[PDB]
Design a protein around this ligand. Structure first.
Ligand SMILES: CC(=O)N1C[C@H](CO)[C@H](c2ccccc2)C1
Length: 181
């Protein structure tokens, strides 16, 4: 409807795939080459389905900060025959707060879904499903089951991936440029 949805759509139409693990279907953001991200609770194994294609996982790394605290981001290298458009220049370099974000989801359950979530707070620490987690962004939208892996964008930046909610608030893990050097 406006420039927020325009940037979100541009990311969804070229830089997402539908990922299926034994723990469900997730929106999966492709970042560059054959490297993508997914929430760590997806429990990626040696094989994953990518748009319903059986795909070998060449590498998977669950990120933690230098306090050895969960970040809830897994970086996956896929044995896919095609590269993603390189979007690393849209990633923030530092932890920050944001105005006027969009959460965008694409699965079998929720195709072509875009949610204007509004103001995004650098929340920091969250006990996420019992696991201490750092670098959490919060937005005041009642997000639901099926939105995990959803991409959070502002005009010009890709800032996080949706990892949870409490029925009133939604929570994303930060994406930082330094994760993809
Ligand atoms: C990962 C990928 O897409 N590849 C295609 C090929 C055979 O269809 C290999 C494979 C390896 C393991 C499972 C499925 C496929 C690698």
């Amino acid at each position: 409807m406006g420039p927020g949805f325009d940037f979100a759509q541009a990311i969804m139409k070229k830089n997402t795939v539908i990922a299926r693990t034994e723990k469900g279907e997730f929106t999966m953001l492709g970042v560059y080459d054959r490297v993508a991200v997914i929430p760590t609770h997806a429990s990626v194994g040696e094989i994953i389905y990518i748009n319903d294609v059986e795909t070998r996982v060449l590498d998977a790394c669950a990120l933690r900060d230098l306090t050895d605290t969960n970040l809830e981001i897994t970086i996956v290298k896929l044995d896919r025959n095609q590269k993603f458009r390189d979007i690393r220049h849209f990633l923030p370099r530092c932890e920050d707060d944001y105005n006027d974000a969009v959460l965008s989801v694409h699965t079998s359950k929720f195709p072509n879904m875009y949610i204007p979530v509004g103001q995004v707070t650098n929340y920091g620490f969250l006990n996420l499903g019992g696991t201490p987690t750092h670098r959490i962004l919060m937005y005041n939208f009642p997000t639901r089951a099926g939105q995990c892996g959803g991409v959070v964008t502002t005009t010009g930046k890709v800032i996080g991936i949706h990892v949870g909610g409490n029925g009133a608030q939604g929570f994303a893990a930060m994406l930082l440029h330094s994760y993809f050097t």
